[PDB]
């Protein structure tokens, strides 16, 4: 009987097998349900896909085909929900969103 990755059974790109192990060896609980790693791997792929899709756009908008830290930054900080999920995180070489206070603009 040939082997099928648990990832493929769930139709996932992220490793249900690897995730399942990290949970067991991760000092989280005495036991890990069969559905836990599948559910977690699925959620990780989703968030990964979300950031990448936005970063991709950011790269195109600058005539680049290669995603660099700066794009990851723009994608995250321009998304209300991602910015909040990563509100205490710092992205190296990410930079800052252009923002000049109105009172500072010439009058």
């Amino acid at each position: 009987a040939k082997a099928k990755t648990r990832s493929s059974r769930a139709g996932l790109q992220f490793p249900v097998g690897r995730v399942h192990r990290l949970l067991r060896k991760g000092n989280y609980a005495e036991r890990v349900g069969a559905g836990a790693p599948v559910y977690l791997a699925a959620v990780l792929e989703y968030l990964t896909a979300e950031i990448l899709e936005l970063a991709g756009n950011a790269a195109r908008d600058n005539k680049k085909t290669r995603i660099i830290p700066r794009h990851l930054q723009l994608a995250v900080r321009n998304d209300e929900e991602l910015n909040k999920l990563l509100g205490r995180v710092t992205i190296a070489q990410g930079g800052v969103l252009p923002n000049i206070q109105s009172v500072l603009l010439p009058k």
Binding site: A42, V43, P69, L85
Partner: protein, 93 residues
């Protein structure tokens, strides 16, 4: 010595979302740290949920509740959709 990563999985997802787009080493590192971060958060919260309720098993239920607690607004909703989706499909095969 073998040091595992999420690189290949992050790249697979990248090819599904932007087939003609690449990623720099530093960007892949950042993506790799992000996955581990989210992993620890979710697993950590799921860990406590089991403890609080005197359970010794981390099931899909804890993962789901952990997601609802940690992810803002729509992210959580869609993340739960994807989570449930996968588990359902996995139960089939």
């Amino acid at each position: 010595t073998r040091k595992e990563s999420y690189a290949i999985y992050v790249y697979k997802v990248l090819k599904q979302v932007h087939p003609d787009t690449g990623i720099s080493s530093k960007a892949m590192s950042i993506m790799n740290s992000f996955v581990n971060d989210v992993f620890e958060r979710i697993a950590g919260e799921a860990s406590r949920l089991a403890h609080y309720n005197k359970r010794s098993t981390i099931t899909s239920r804890e993962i789901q509740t952990a997601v609802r607690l940690l992810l803002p607004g729509e992210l959580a909703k869609h993340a739960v959709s994807e989570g449930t989706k996968a588990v359902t499909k996995y139960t089939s095969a």
